[PDB]
């Protein structure tokens, strides 16, 4: 099999503002051709019939407690759960144990993401060292070894001297700073930090992205930051809105919120949420609150702009990350489909409705429903 036909779809590509009913033709893991009716030899064949053929997802907020707590999760587990919902590239934090501070855990991390072979996981460093607070990290060397963002998530940067010179050297590195995810009280102000983060983003001329936000003014804040010129961003957890659902939902609505990205976060005794982020998302499109289209972008080209990656496209010779999802349907996290190693979310055992059929990556099939 030389090549891969994808076949009587719904393609939609915002970064293209292309959709439409076309055929996807795939040849050495590249997008190749976007057409109707396309026949070629040598080719699998996907009917993607009644289905939605889009950019790879990217969820730019993944906890995979490895290494350290791989009893809760690990990167083979958690790979299973991104691919299964859609996602063909996930971001993990840095709060693993040992934490990702050192170029032989970023190895670590790489080679395992080979070894398992089904999503990209892209790491990301401490913004100090141990995450401790007090001494900022080697960026460039844990950028050069593969880090595409800098963040000390688990615990907040409450320094602001270190959060400015985090943004600094985010600046000259070209990559975001992540900030204020509490995840560390369970692995191991709100306004006011995001604004001090805004003015920080906009004296240095660093990207920041906010990965927790949870009020209206918190929401007007990085509106007014961003309609300055300020590079900030934020996201949701699409699970987490079936604090303040309703600013939220209406923070997605109109934009302010970048993207949906998991803070997939395995606890035993945080939600998990790659598997079900789809479904959930979908239930805002059902609503009318988004389109379709902006759903896509939200899993896709957003994202990828907040890391900095040229994926979250379909673009003629960009690498064949594809997903393929039924909107409608339905299925239930459970014992039976359940691929986390945890079983955290309120979603367990609910009626969803929206589910991958195929996730394809670099013009590999990785995952089939
Ligand atoms: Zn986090």
């Given at each position: 099999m030389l090549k891969l036909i994808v076949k009587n779809g719904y393609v939609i590509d915002p970064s293209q503002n292309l959709e439409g009913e076309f055929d996807i033709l795939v040849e050495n893991g590249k997008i190749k051709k976007i057409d109707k009716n396309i026949l070629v030899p040598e080719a699998e064949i996907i009917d993607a019939k009644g289905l939605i053929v889009c950019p790879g997802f990217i969820d730019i907020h993944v906890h995979l407690?490895?290494?350290?707590?791989?009893?809760?999760?690990?990167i083979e587990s958690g790979s299973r759960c991104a691919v299964a919902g859609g996602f063909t590239t996930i971001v993990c934090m840095p709060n693993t144990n040992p934490p990702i501070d050192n170029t032989t855990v970023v190895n670590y991390i790489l080679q395992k993401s080979k070894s398992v072979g089904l999503c990209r996981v892209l790491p990301t460093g401490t913004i100090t060292k141990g995450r401790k607070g007090k001494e900022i990290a080697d960026f460039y060397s844990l950028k050069e070894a593969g880090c595409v963002a800098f963040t000390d998530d688990g615990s907040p940067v409450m320094d602001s001297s270190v959060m400015r010179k985090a943004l600094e050297l985010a600046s000259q590195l070209g990559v975001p700073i992540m900030d204020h995810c509490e995840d560390d009280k369970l692995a191991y102000a709100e306004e006011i930090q995001i604004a001090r983060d805004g003015i920080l983003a906009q004296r240095t001329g660093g990207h920041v992205h906010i990965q927790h936000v949870s009020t209206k003014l918190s929401l007007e804040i990085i509106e007014f930051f961003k309609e300055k010129g300020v590079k900030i961003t934020c996201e949701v957890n699409?699970?987490?809105?079936?604090?303040?659902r309703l600013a939220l939902i209406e923070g997605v609505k109109r934009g302010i919120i970048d993207c949906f990205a998991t803070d997939h976060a395995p606890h035993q005794t945080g939600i998990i949420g790659l598997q079900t982020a789809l479904p959930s998302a979908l239930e805002l499109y059902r609503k009318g609150i988004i389109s379709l289209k902006k759903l896509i972008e939200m899993f896709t080209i957003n994202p990828a702009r907040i890391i900095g990656v040229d994926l979250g496209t379909l673009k003629?010779?960009?690498?064949?990350?594809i997903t393929i999802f039924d909107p409608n349907k339905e299925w239930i996290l459970n014992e039976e489909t359940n691929l986390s190693?945890?079983?955290?979310?309120?979603?367990?055992g609910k009626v969803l409705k929206g589910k991958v059929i195929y996730t394809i990556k670099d013009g590999k099939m990785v995952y089939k429903d």
């Open positions: 407690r490895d290494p350290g707590q791989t009893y809760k999760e690990d699409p699970n987490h809105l079936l604090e303040d003629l010779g960009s690498p064949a990350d190693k945890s079983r955290n979310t309120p979603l367990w």
